[PDB]
């Protein structure tokens, strides 16, 4: 039931300091678990960053030990990562995870002689860049039944010209999930991203059901709720 969620600024300037937090829910941080940070640079493999045990010590990847610090806030049930003097090589998706206790001596319970990484956060995208944050413009993709099955129509939202990744899109505040297809973003020659989210709905509902796409771009602290209506 223990769940993890990363938070932190998605854009860090070169030579700046990356600061991320992982919220623990459904369980307490005050255990023998090893609260862990992992990252995946784009196109590269998983890399272990470090771990911390409440009341115990820390332990770091030696290749990053000169720049990484991991803390615990027992009052908030959080643990955190700080990575200093960042460069392009630190652009990655960062994950927090939970590692159960392990033993170094004999006569421990048998479970503690196995290493594994049980629970994972969803990951947060960090882009190291001198470029400035840009919020998206959201436009409707008016309904069309040309490419959909009989009695249905596709409508959507274009999320245009934002930086950096990512944006999330829901529909009707999460009440509409069936038939939703959010496409991965394109990176334009401008250096800005754009993506589209489309939902296929019954054609009989078009004149009577309100459809709103909920766009969140956390790096720019922008939220847009765009009403999508049929053309006239």
């Amino acid at each position: 039931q223990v769940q993890l969620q990363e938070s932190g600024p998605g854009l860090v300037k070169p030579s700046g300091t990356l600061s991320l937090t992982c919220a623990i829910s459904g369980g307490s941080i005050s255990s023998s678990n090893w609260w862990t940070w992992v990252r995946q640079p784009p196109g590269k493999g998983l890399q272990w960053i470090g771990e911390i045990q409440h009341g115990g010590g820390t332990n770091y990847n030696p290749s990053l030990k000169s720049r990484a610090t991991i803390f615990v806030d027992v009052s908030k049930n959080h643990f955190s990562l700080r990575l200093s003097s960042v460069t392009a090589a630190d652009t990655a998706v960062y994950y927090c995870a939970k590692v159960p206790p392990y033993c170094t001596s004999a006569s421990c319970p048998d479970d503690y002689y196995y290493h594994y990484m049980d629970v994972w956060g969803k990951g947060t995208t960090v882009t190291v860049s001198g470029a400035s944050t840009k919020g998206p413009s959201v436009f409707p993709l008016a309904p069309s039944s040309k490419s959909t099955s009989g009695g249905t129509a596709a409508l959507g939202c274009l999320v245009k010209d934002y930086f950096p990744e990512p944006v999330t899109v829901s529909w009707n505040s999460g009440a509409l999930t069936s038939g939703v297809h959010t496409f991965p973003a394109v990176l334009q020659s401008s250096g800005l991203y754009s993506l589209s989210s489309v939902v296929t709905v019954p054609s009989s509902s078009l004149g009577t059901q309100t459809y709103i796409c909920n766009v969140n771009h956390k790096p720019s602290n922008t939220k847009v709720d765009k009403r999508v209506e049929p053309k006239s």
């Binding site: 862990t36 992992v38 995946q40 493999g45 998983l46 890399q47 272990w48 771990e51 332990n59 770091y60 990847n61 030696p62 994950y95 590692v99 392990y102 170094t104 002689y113 196995y114 290493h115 594994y116 990484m117 049980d118 994972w120 956060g121 969803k122 990951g123 413009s137 436009f139 409707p140 993709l141 008016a142 069309s144 040309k146 490419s147 959909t148 596709a154 959507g156 274009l158 245009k160 297809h181 496409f183 991965p184 973003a185 394109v186 990176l187 334009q188 020659s189 754009s194 993506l195 589209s196 489309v198």
Partner: protein, 210 residues
């Protein structure tokens, strides 16, 4: 310290074996993580064939000394992914180690034709002095498509940006192509077209200013 086969292929429905090697496996054994693009890693196997709930029983594996295996029987399209070996060193500060990853290719997946949806620019975007055409491509396999745009019937030489294909939840591929125009370009032509070619067949959708 942790070495795994970087590339393995298996025919759909057959059994595949992915191996990992390292002295760190003697102490705390190997664990395996499935990694798909846009998604967090998922523990599939660890220890003596311990399988988390939610992992299908076609996944199994074990560690013997400095070696470990992950076995997938009756491999399926959704099993195509990267698989990472994982361990904890027994020396020094006991760092956690990752293998370089194994890219598992599942051969002989069935072909699917693309569905294409083309949206014209919104009137609100035109009022902001811009115009974007959105061509959405879904449900195709294999994940190789070529996308071409036409202004009336003339090829478009500027403004096109197309994504690399990405897996859908149904293990087919999706992609999107954007054409950035000025409102003047959009209104000066009778129509614009998005042409998607896949496995020798072409689907063309056309929209017009109105």
């Amino acid at each position: 310290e942790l070495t795994q086969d970087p590339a393995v292929s298996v025919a759909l429905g057959q059994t595949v074996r992915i191996t990992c090697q390292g002295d760190s496996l003697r102490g705390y054994s190997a664990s395996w993580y499935q990694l798909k693009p846009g998604q967090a890693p998922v523990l599939v196997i660890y220890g003596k064939n311990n399988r988390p709930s939610g992992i299908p029983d076609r996944f199994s594996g074990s560690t013997s000394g400095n070696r470990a295996s992950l076995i997938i029987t009756g491999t399926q399209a959704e099993d195509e992914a990267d698989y990472y070996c994982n361990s904890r060193d027994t020396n020094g500060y006991r760092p956690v180690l990752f293998g370089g990853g194994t890219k598992l290719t599942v051969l002989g997946q069935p072909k699917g034709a693309p569905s294409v949806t083309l949206f014209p620019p919104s009137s609100e975007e035109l009022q902001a002095n811009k115009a974007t055409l959105v061509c959405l491509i879904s449900d195709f396999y294999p994940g190789a498509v070529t996308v071409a745009w036409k202004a009336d019937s003339s090829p478009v030489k500027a403004g096109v940006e197309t994504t690399t294909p990405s897996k859908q939840s149904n293990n087919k591929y999706a992609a999107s192509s954007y054409l950035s125009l000025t409102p003047e370009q959009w209104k000066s032509h009778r129509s614009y077209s998005c042409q998607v070619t896949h496995e020798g067949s072409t689907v063309e959708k056309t929209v017009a200013p109105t």
